[PDB]
């Protein structure tokens, strides 16, 4: 079966989201983004594990599944959706593994360790993914971003990682944010290599 090549993991889903709302969101986004490859819905079903905070999407075609990987990081009800292959996915012969389209405004959640990867610590815990992304985007467009959540409670842990499109924005964000006081917290903004364990 092509079935594992027609399914995607979606993490960090909004609390209380229904399977139908998730399906409507992705079917509409696929059509609006020009990713859908025929009339009708590309997403057939959604299974939510509400307790563990993830969903699986099932698509009608291998190719539309691949294109939907381009939605990684899309904001849905304030949250950056983490879109991933199933762990047992294996590319089929002759079928592409990576998406061929770009979705304007969608920022990847995949932030690899790299020279200019930034750590941002001390963020107020009431800021959602969208608001932290907006804070960072004020300095320049992002290539990648993730805000770290507690996997049991879903609450922000108050620190994030990001990578700017322009490597030179990195030091501008550091200058603008490092050491800023918010309540009892003080932002630490530095390249993530500096304080990694």
């Amino acid at each position: 079966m092509t079935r594992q090549a027609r399914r995607l993991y979606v993490g960090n889903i909004p609390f209380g989201i229904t399977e139908e709302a998730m399906m409507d969101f992705f079917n509409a986004q696929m059509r609006l983004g020009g990713l859908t490859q025929a009339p009708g819905n590309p997403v057939l079903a959604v299974q939510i594990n509400q307790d563990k905070n993830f969903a699986f999407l099932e698509f009608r075609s291998v190719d539309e599944t691949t294109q939907a990987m381009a939605f990684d990081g899309i904001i849905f009800q304030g949250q950056s959706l983490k879109i991933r292959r199933p762990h047992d996915y294996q590319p089929l012969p002759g079928m592409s593994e990576n998406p061929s389209v770009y979705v304007p405004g969608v920022v990847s959640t995949v932030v690899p360790d790299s020279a200019h990867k930034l750590f941002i610590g001390g963020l107020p815990n009431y800021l959602n993914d969208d608001q932290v992304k907006e804070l960072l985007t004020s300095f320049g467009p992002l290539k990648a971003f993730n805000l770290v959540k507690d996997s049991a409670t879903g609450l922000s842990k108050g620190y994030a990682f990001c990578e700017y499109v322009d490597i030179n924005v990195t030091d501008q964000a550091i200058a603008g944010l490092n050491g800023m006081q918010l309540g009892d917290k003080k932002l630490l903004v530095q390249r993530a290599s500096v304080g990694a364990k």
Side-chain angles (χ1 to χ4, degrees), residues 2-14 16-51 53-89 91-95 97-183 185-197:
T2 56
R3 182 157 184 265
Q4 286 308 89
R6 289 188 294 98
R7 261 151 75 70
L8 294 178
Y9 164 94
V10 185
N12 189 40
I13 59 174
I17 197 76
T18 68
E19 288 174 349
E20 313 89 78
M22 286 269 296
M23 200 156 44
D24 285 358
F25 177 76
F26 275 99
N27 278 325
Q29 282 283 343
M30 290 278 295
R31 178 81 51 195
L32 288 159
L35 310 195
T36 187
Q37 287 181 5
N41 292 340
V43 181
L44 302 177
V46 175
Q47 288 87 49
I48 292 173
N49 186 321
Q50 317 268 3
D51 179 34
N53 185 227
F54 69 87
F56 271 80
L57 315 179
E58 182 157 336
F59 293 80
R60 66 178 173 190
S61 73
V62 166
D63 281 344
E64 287 166 313
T65 302
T66 296
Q67 298 293 74
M69 288 284 290
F71 287 124
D72 178 52
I74 188 164
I75 293 293
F76 185 39
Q77 299 184 8
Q79 310 220 151
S80 315
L81 298 185
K82 317 303 185 58
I83 302 181
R84 303 284 184 279
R85 293 289 185 178
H87 286 331
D88 62 2
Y89 161 77
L92 309 164
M95 306 298 288
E97 153 145 37
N98 302 113
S100 73
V101 182
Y102 166 76
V103 179
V106 170
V107 177
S108 174
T109 64
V110 176
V111 195
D113 292 353
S114 77
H116 304 292
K117 175 174 178 173
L118 265 187
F119 169 81
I120 308 97
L123 295 161
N125 60 37
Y126 53 78
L127 297 171
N128 64 19
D129 300 342
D130 192 39
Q131 289 298 313
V132 179
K133 187 171 70 63
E134 196 63 35
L135 174 73
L136 297 169
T137 297
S138 63
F139 294 93
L142 290 165
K143 188 177 294 135
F145 162 79
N146 74 291
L147 174 65
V148 178
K149 308 299 192 47
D150 186 291
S151 47
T153 64
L155 302 175
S156 174
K157 288 177 110 172
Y159 56 93
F161 301 86
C162 76
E163 181 185 353
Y164 284 101
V165 169
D166 178 5
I167 68 171
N168 301 304
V169 173
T170 311
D171 285 340
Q172 301 174 351
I174 290 167
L177 298 172
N178 187 42
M180 189 171 289
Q181 185 75 47
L182 309 160
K185 289 180 185 176
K186 186 176 170 177
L187 300 187
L188 178 57
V189 182
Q190 66 190 13
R191 282 170 177 83
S193 61
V194 170
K197 344 296 190 210

